[PDB]
C-alpha cells in the first residue's frame, strides 16, 4: 500500500538542469516531511534536501545549496527536486523518503548522470 | 489609506524570536518564557542612541533601520495598535543612563518625537538608589506585577547604561475552560520525570493543523483566541511524548506562525491543557553577542555618539524579564509533555509572547 515512487533521471551536460519527481501513495502525505537523498558507489548516502509538511521550511545538503530547490503539493501528493547547474560531482542514484518520526518511508531510487 | 505596520510587525517578531532560539538553546531544558517584539522595542530604541559599528551590527541583526522614513511612525503606531484594547497585558521599556553624562544637543527631543518616552537619568554610583529606581520603574509599569529584577546586582558604581523590558500577561479566553473539568494529571518532563499538574479541559471547534518539520517531528497546533479576537494563543505540542520540542524551536520563525494560521481549519477538539505560571529573567548579553552585537557591550569599541561623546560608555546590563499565567478565566489533544507557546497579536502578525512550558 506504501509506495514512493521517483521519476526524471537521466544524463545531462554538465551546466544543465533536470526535474525530479516522486509520487506517494497509501499514507496521510500532507502530515509527512519529504526528502531527498544521494549515494554513489564507494560514497556514502548523504540528505539533499528536506521539506516541511507546511510552510515550505527546507534544509539543503552544503554541496547543493544555491543550485537544488525541493517543492511539494499536498493535494497532488508529490515532491519535486529542481537540479540546476549540475555537475559532475552530482552523479548518483537520488532516493525519496517521506518521514514522520518515528516513522520512514523509502523509494525505489532514479539514477542521474552528468557528464 | 493605511495598512497594518506587519513588515515591521514582522521584521521585529523575527529578530525577537531569534534571541528566544539563543536564550532556548542556552537552557538545560528548563521554563523560558518571552517576549520577541519587547526585545525588538527595547533594541530599536537603542539603534537611535548608537552610531558607527555599533548601529551596523544592530541594524544587520534586526533587518531594519530605525533611521528610515517612518519606521518609528509604525513602531509607535504598532505599539498603540497593540495597547488599545487592553491588566491582562502590561508592557514596559526602559534605558537608564548615568545622569553626569553630557547628552547630544538634539537626542532627547528627538527621542520623544518618536517614541513617546524617555531616557530615564540616574546617579549609578549611588548603588542602592539607582536599583531602587529601576526596580520601581519596572514594578509601576507593569502594574505591580513584575516587582523585581534580579539582574540589577550586577549595577555597581562604574554601571553607566541599562536597558530594561519587562512584560506580563494573563489573558482571558474567548471561550473559558469550565471551572468544574480542572483535574490533576501527570505531565512527562523531559528528563523522563511526571509531576501531577493541575489540568483545564475543554470540549470545542478549535482552529488546528499539524505540523512537522524538515527532518521529520510532528506537532499539534492549536489556536485558543482571547477574549478579544485581537489576541491568540498558539500552542505547538509534540504529537507523542517521545518527540523533542526543541526541533520545533530551532526552526521558528514569525512568517512560520503565520502560514499556521493560514491553513489552520476549525475543528472538533478536546482540549487538555495545563494551567501554569511562567516567570523569567533574561540577561539579553550572550544571546544578543551570538547575533552579532558584541561592540555595544564593551567600554571602548561601542559607539553611543548619538546619545553622548563621552566615554567609555557601553550597555552594562540588558534584562528582559517576562511573567505569563494561563488559567481557566472524536479527537483529543492531551498536553501532558512539554510543549511551546506563542502569543500573537492578528491584525499585524506581531510575536507578543513566545516559550516553552517543560514544567507547569
Redesign the interface.
Known sequence: QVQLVESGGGLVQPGGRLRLSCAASGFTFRTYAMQWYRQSPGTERELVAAISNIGGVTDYGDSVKGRFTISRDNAKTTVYLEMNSLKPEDTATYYCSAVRLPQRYWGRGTQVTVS | VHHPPSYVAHLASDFGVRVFQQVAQASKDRNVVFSPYGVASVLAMLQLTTGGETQQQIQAAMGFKIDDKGMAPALRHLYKELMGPWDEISTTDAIFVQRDLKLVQGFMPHFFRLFRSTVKQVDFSEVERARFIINDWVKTHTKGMISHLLGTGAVDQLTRLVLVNALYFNGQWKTPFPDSSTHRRLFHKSDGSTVSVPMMAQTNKFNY??????????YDILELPYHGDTLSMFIAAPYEK??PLSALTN?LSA??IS??KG?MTRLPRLLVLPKFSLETEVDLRKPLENLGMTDMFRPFQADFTSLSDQEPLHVALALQKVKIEVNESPEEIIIDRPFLFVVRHNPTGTVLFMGQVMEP
Not at chain 2, 493543523?209 to 517531528?217: A, I, L, N, W, Y
Open positions: 493543523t499539524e505540523f512537522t518539520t524538515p527532518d521529520g517531528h510532528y517521545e518527540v526552526i512568517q512560520l502560514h499556521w491553513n
